[PDB]
Amino acid sequence: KLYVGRAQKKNERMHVLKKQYEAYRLEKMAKYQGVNLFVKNLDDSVDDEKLEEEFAPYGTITSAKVMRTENGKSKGFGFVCFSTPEEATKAITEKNQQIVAGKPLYVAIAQRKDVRRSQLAQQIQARNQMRYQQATAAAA
Amino acid sequence: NSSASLYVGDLEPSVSEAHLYDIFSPIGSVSSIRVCRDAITKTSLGYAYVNFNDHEAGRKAIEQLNYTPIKGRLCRIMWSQRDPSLRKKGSGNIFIKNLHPDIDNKALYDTFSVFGDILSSKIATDENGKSKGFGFVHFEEEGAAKEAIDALNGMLLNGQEIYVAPHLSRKERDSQLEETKAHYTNLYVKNINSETTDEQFQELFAKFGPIVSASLEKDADGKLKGFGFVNYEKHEDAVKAVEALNDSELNGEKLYVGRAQKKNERMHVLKKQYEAYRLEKMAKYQGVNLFVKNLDDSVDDEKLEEEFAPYGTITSAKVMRTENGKSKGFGFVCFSTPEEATKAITEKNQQIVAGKPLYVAIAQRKDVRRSQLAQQIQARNQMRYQQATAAAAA
Amino acid sequence: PPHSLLQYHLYAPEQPSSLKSLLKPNERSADQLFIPNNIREDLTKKNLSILQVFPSSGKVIPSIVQDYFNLVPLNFNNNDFLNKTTLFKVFSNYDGKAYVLKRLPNIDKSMNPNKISKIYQIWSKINCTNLIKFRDIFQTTKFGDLSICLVFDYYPNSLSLYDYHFVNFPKFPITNNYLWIYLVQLTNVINSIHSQNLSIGNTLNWRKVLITGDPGRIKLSHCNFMDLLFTIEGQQQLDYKYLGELLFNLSINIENSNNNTAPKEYRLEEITPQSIDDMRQIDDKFKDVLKYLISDNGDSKKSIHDLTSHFYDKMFMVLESSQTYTEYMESVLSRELENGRLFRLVNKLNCIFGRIESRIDINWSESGTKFPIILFYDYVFHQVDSNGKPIMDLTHVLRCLNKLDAGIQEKLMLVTPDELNCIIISYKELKDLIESTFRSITQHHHH
Amino acid sequence: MHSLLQYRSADQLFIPNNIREDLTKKNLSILQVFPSSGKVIPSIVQDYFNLVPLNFNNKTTLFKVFSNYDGKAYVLKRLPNIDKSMNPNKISKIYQIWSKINCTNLIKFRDIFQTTKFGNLSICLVFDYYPNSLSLYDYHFVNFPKFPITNNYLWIYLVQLTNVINSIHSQNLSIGNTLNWRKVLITGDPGRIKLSHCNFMDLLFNDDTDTVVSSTIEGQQQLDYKYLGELLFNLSINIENSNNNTAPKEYRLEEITPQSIDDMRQIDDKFKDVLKYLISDNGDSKKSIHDLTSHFYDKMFMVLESSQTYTEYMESVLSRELENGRLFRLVNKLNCIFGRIESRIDINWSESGTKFPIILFYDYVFHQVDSNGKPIMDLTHVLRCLNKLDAGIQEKLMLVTPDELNCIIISYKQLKDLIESTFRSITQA
Amino acid sequence: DYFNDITSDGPISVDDETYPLSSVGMPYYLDKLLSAWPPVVFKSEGTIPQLLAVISSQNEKLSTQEFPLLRYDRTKYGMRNAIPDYVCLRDIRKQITSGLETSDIQTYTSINKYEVPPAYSRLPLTSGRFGTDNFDFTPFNNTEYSGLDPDVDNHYTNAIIQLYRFIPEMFNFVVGCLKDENFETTLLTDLGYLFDMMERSHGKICSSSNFQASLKSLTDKRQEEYLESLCIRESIEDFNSSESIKRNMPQKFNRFLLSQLIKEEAQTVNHNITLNQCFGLETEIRTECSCDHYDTTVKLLPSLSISGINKTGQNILPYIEYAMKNVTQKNSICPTCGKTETITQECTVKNLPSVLSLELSLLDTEFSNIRSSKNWLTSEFYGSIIKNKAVLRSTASELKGTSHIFKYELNGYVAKITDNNNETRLVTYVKKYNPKENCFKWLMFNDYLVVEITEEEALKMTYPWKTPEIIIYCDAEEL
Amino acid sequence: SISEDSLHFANRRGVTKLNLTSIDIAAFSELNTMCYSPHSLKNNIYCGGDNTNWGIASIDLNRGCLDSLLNYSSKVKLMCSNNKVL
RNA sequence: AAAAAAAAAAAAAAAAAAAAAAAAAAAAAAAAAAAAAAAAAAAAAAAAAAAAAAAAAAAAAAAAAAA
Ligand SMILES: [Mg+2]
């Protein structure tokens, strides 16, 4: 036993090496353009590694946190990387409108950090305006 | 905050949205009906949804119509707001089991609505009303469900308890019929030496499933077959000694334990044989076999084997007929040679043997359905061109 | 007529600010070029709020009230539920003027027009920020019957502060900034009612205080006939009661807006000095302000001085904030104006550029003047970099657009297109050249 | 489809009559820089360039400069007379004392540097250039025209200077001689007057800033009260005097006259209380700005009135200006790659070429001939087409040469796709 | 052609304010429009912007109120439509910062190809008599080789100093010239004193102010083909400039530097032409203006500027074979034609001198191709006069030519480093031969930094920050 | 459509999908006639050349670029195929 | 004399194999049995388990010149 006690990443950005190295990382992030995509609807008939080698022909996943709930219950979600936005476009055009069992394997970009609730807010507003309008017209 | 967007589950294909509109039109605020004809072949997912402009009329249509027969099948109308979260959470339909085989979601819903509005209620109510005596009942959330657990675990309901403590698999009305004290799948141990007695079948075996009944199986021939029936406590310990005591030593000899007279509660033995047949059923050839259709009737396995004798090691020559009478075209020769089969792709495809040509393709019942898909494609295509023709033909 | 958004990062998308987290003062951006997204979407929401109608009738409500047509209701969160509401948007004959019209039906003991006339002129002579125009009051035979109509301006984003902080979707509270801002707005309007010699009116406490403007507004619409629709020193004493009520209310609602929990209002018999001394994230000087705003015991109609006899610095910091908002508003308005000028400029640019018969040679020049026109076009638009790859830099372009938009006498060297025929040229000459070319082609009387 | 036809004083007091014209004239003043200045100091001196001057005696020390490090119009002052700054300790101390000095009407200290570029040594400092710098005496009396001054503007400027007082005395310091009318700078049609000089050039020469506890800055507070009083008094008596032209009436601390400060022409008792609070510089008072603001007590609300009214007027006119940025990025994408000299004559851009009709519609809008064949704009049709192509909807489009060739009937989203594809291919490989 | 055109009445072509640019346009869309702008740096605001050949009838056919001028040159005013890089006085603040402290700066190896290693950086200033102070150099060199000091107005020829110190033909020639007085030969003698000082200093630091001032005062003593070289020369003053390291300056400096070296060589007390024959390319250049009124002239031009016309596979030797023998045309006016004279001109080097210079002037596309072509340049090639051209193969087995296969081994070159901090400086690469061990070494010389790197690193051109410009092949035996 | 030099393919709308010349090999230099390829009928062509590379070629019309080339030396006047013949 | 069309559009169809009670068999040690969106709808990048982070690298310069 050479008991190698690992250290988690606590050292961050003291020398110039993380400053210029994260400048190169930001230069990479200027050139990824939605590589690591949020996998939505990990379906029942599609497993984690089943997904990871269905899309291994269609991207290089440098960071693969594709799991289920410790493979107990489903996550329903993961992360699968792609090549380029036009390879993302062909991945859109090839794997589309296929029900596996009940939910489509919709691997795409990440959004909705509010905007689901902004939509739900403006839809409630629209329903209120249209509901007074239709109540007024029905009350004639 | 949706007004109403409501689950309608355990459907049947007769119920269209016209019939749902005829049901829910005197409720008062009909917004829309999302019939979940899933996009494989317009099939239901087991359910659909109805959307209402009114939240109160939606709550009305739930609490009036929950397992009521819409066109003869009871309507499993519940909430499904957290149900895509139950989908991409794994949670949802919990196993409130040992339910009643004569009580549906409506009567037990109105019974245990004092325990809560059951947001995911199902019993085993298939077969137009028949429950098998269990199901996946789950309430609002963990608190109401845990209230039902800690309040009612083992109470009486028409002479039957419930079991949500363990995730109890199917056949629960007939659970005690499985647990009856006479029948049990024994364990045939093959090739036993005569040293093993009724005492010896209980010594190292009662730990792996308790034994009172230990029978040194002599046959109707006086001797031993070498096969002795080990009578454990449960068919899971039949599992434990078919896949743990396999060729084991009781004293010094083999325990080839097979399942003496399986009672079907553990299953799927040799179903992989099925998938072994999937090496050669619809993906028929493995570049070896030859589905040679459209022989002559005088071309039996006689003349098929006669033609394919230069085409490698013939292993299976076989023509299915009208009960060994009239073949309606097709035979098969499973080869042992793939390159002679390629030589037949050259030669014995587009081949007169007697007077009528051979027809060669890999043999599947799989993509008959895909061919029907292509028939749907060409049908909608000719419908489209006829629609354009009748439109612009004026 | 259909319900959709067209703002799902669709009018103009969002941009990753992680590059802006590590960015240089030379490094500019398109929002730094044009506008941040928030003001844009707020103004477009205001525009659609002005024109929340797609061409229909709406004849089920009465639709024309004495040259005020298109009666359309303010249904933001309208507190007249299960009832035909009274507060509408309407369009006048003059200005098409966007008006809140409020019609009060079913009156009998208010038949004198003199009472509403003196309440009219007595409150038409008033003039303040939060003192929305009190107009156009008469009883009519429509909106049911005997509807006393009054008119305020339309003023969108009905944000009675419970809307602005608790119905509010991102849930932001109001810290000490908007505290003192609303303090000086209320101090303004109580100075206004001590000036114009009227009461507190009727409404406060998340009622009629809809925030139309951006930087923190009161905009208190209703200070009107509470009971006399059909002393004054006591009313200008109970102004402190209403006011210290709202101040205790929001001064403890900061502790509830710590989380995302909708509060309840905490009326006069909850004003307790232990809660004054024990609430958190409050200035203790402001706690002593509320100790004075423990309501008016000595019933003189007390002016705003004894209120403001604790402080004047934070009023200046509010004034500071208002000047800051106006200044960078003028900054981004200067950016928008120069964009409009340069867009008209490039409209003039490509107006004559690219004739079909001109595109013959390598450079696409037909006649005498056209090559000294399109001389510019390579180093203005087609700017390959120093490394050699053809790219676009919006800030070299805009500095060029600045230097050319005036048409100054300063020259510039160019190489076009053979890198032998060099040139230098001054920019007034370019301006006059484009003008003469524009009259040479779009003469606009014959050509 | 989606829209139709759409969108002297008392308290507002800030009403330019052609206001966007005024603002683009201000930015026009921000624009040019005369390159042939002939100055012995070149352009590129100490992280700044294109040094063009302003009016004589801060004939220089007022330089309009476009910046190298920032890229922003700045003002520079030379101090072309001192030559000794032996301690960078005190230079760093001044960098502390004004790099932390933060206000609105105090224009922000940017940096200082003693150069040798004019021939001599000179401790040149920079601040922020504002367009069209004037005094109030410029805004009325020195320069055309002379707007007739009301007491309202006097209250406004009073609020401005009390803001400055609150600012520098929150910074527990003072000013010195800057409160002559000349050494302050107004900021346009409103007052909003932003001082610049702040009289700290003496601090480069000796050391009297709150260390002399005689502090002496309280004497400077009372001094600036006196400067404030003579400033407002000359403003008052000159506004009454130069109703047309009688300007100035230059009065001093010697000509303070608290008799005729109180016997002024048109200043009320509240103004008279203000100037009497200024002029009665007595012993041990150290006069409370809380007391003087309690004497003021109303005008804070009036300048908030004018501020938010002018603000709402700005966004009310800004409503019909916003449709530029999307449009300008459209033109950026458009003329970013249209006639690149490698792609002027090549295979994939001919009539047999790939991106052929992206040319064709381009000038179709831009050279749409009339019934007489004259290419006439009618910019309604232009912007109609521009928003339609910007959208991506599916339409059908006739197109001709004029004669019978290369006619293609097409929709928009594929044009969108080829535009972004070409742009991305240009952007890198 | 859809009828959403019931009315669009007023031709409002530009600048109407009865309708502003606020759109009354679109039908109501659903998704993202065209103006989605991709992220960019936009890092070029405010970087101090600044300011025979007749005009062909590419443009003369449409000239009226004309003012053209056919005067644009590619080395003169750079790349067409280019945008300069940004380097403000925050880089001068970095010059205020120290260079290195308590480590080794000599790291000539970055892990990333984009990052400039510490050895290729600026070395800090040499503070003289500061308060009880002076600047020191002993960590920067540990060898026995003398260093320079960049406090001189060339900024360029310090690398040319370290270059031409390492040619034993040149070196032994000029140190032979030194032993006589030769009072007229200014640059020859003073260059010789400088190289002999660097010789006998043995690691001691040196400067060039004698030879800087001598070169300068000669080029100050100004007002031929010398003067035709000089007509663009003296524009170096008032050092503020967008190019400190400039496109065409050190090339012409080495050009007329060697020209003046051969002039003072021709005006010694012995008047040899040993450097002239030894270095000179026998360019029979044939300016075929007319069929009769034309010129043929053999000039013994010691350098080879690489114009780079079509780069006529990917490597350097066919490009040099183009540069030896090449014909083209020109529109320079010869008087026998009167009008625009469509003259032609061919060039043929007739010898193979033992030292071959290579000055580069080409577009950045081929520089990036050399950054892609690994071992693009040739270490040692063999050349021979085939009938009208020096064929320059690797070995003779490829093609022996028709005349006398030689053995030409590269000594070194001058590397321009345009770093990440947008600082442009020069570094000598050389390969000093050892006869004591018969071996070689690749000495990297920054201004006074002296190290040895490997050959393939010296051959490595793949860095974006690294660019060869001035390349000296020698003869292997003469190396 | 096919000219002496340009092989164009528009869509039935009239909108342009492809058009090429002899791009970098001398494909469309000498042009004779069109065909189709033996994978489908109304699909990618097998365009007839004679000596433009003296090898007849299929080009995948629907991917934008090459399908196949082959070395038939002689000149061809005319070409036909039913499904998989030449 | 149950004697059926000898397969379009690469259609379309074979399986290439078992509880063995043959005789004197009890009551889940399973390792987990565990379906719901769809009015314009579910949305980590950093690089991802500190089961042992000493962390001021002395300093001093009385100062220049060079008549
Ligand atoms: Mg001395």
Residue numbers in the entry:
A (entry chain D): 288 to 427
B (entry chain H): 35 to 428
C (entry chain O): 224 to 453, 467 to 683
D (entry chain N): 225 to 231, 251 to 301, 307 to 462, 466 to 680
E (entry chain A): 345 to 395, 411 to 582, 593 to 681, 692 to 858
F (entry chain A): 87 to 172
Text taken from the publication that reported this structure:
The stability of eukaryotic mRNAs is dependent on a ribonucleoprotein (RNP) complex of poly(A)-binding proteins (PABPC1/Pab1) organized on the poly(A) tail. This poly(A) RNP not only protects mRNAs from premature degradation but also stimulates the Pan2-Pan3 deadenylase complex to catalyze the first step of poly(A) tail shortening. Indeed, the cytoplasmic PABP interacts with and stimulates Pan2-Pan3, the deadenylase complex that trims long poly(A) tails (Uchida et al., 2004). Briefly, Pan2 wraps around an intertwined homodimer formed by two Pan3 protomers (Christie et al., 2013, Jonas et al., 2014, Schäfer et al., 2014, Wahle and Stubbs, 2014).
The cryo-EM structure of Pan2-Pan3 in complex with a poly(A) RNP composed of 90 adenosines and three Pab1 protomers shows how the oligomerization interfaces of Pab1 are recognized by conserved features of the deadenylase and thread the poly(A) RNA substrate into the nuclease active site. The resulting 3D reconstruction reached an overall nominal resolution of 4.8 Å. Pan2-Pan3 has essentially the same structure in the 90A RNP-bound state compared to the substrate-free state. The 90A RNP forms a long tubular structure that zigzags on the surface of Pan2-Pan3. Here, the conserved N-terminal edge of RRM1 packs against the conserved C-terminal α-helix of Pan2. The position of RRM1-RRM2 orients the 3′ end of the RNA at the entrance of the deadenylase cavity, which is shaped by conserved residues of the RNase and UCH-like domains. The Pab1 linker helix contacts a conserved surface of the Pan3straight pseudokinase domain, approaching the ATP-binding site. At the oligomerization interface between the first and second Pab1, the RNP density adopts a sharp V-shaped turn. At the oligomerization interface between the second and third Pab1, the RNP interacts with the WD40 domain of Pan2 at a conserved surface of the base of the β-propeller. The linker helix that extends from RRM4 of one Pab1 protomer interacts with RRM1 of the adjacent one, including a segment of the sequence preceding the RRM1 fold (referred to as leader sequence).
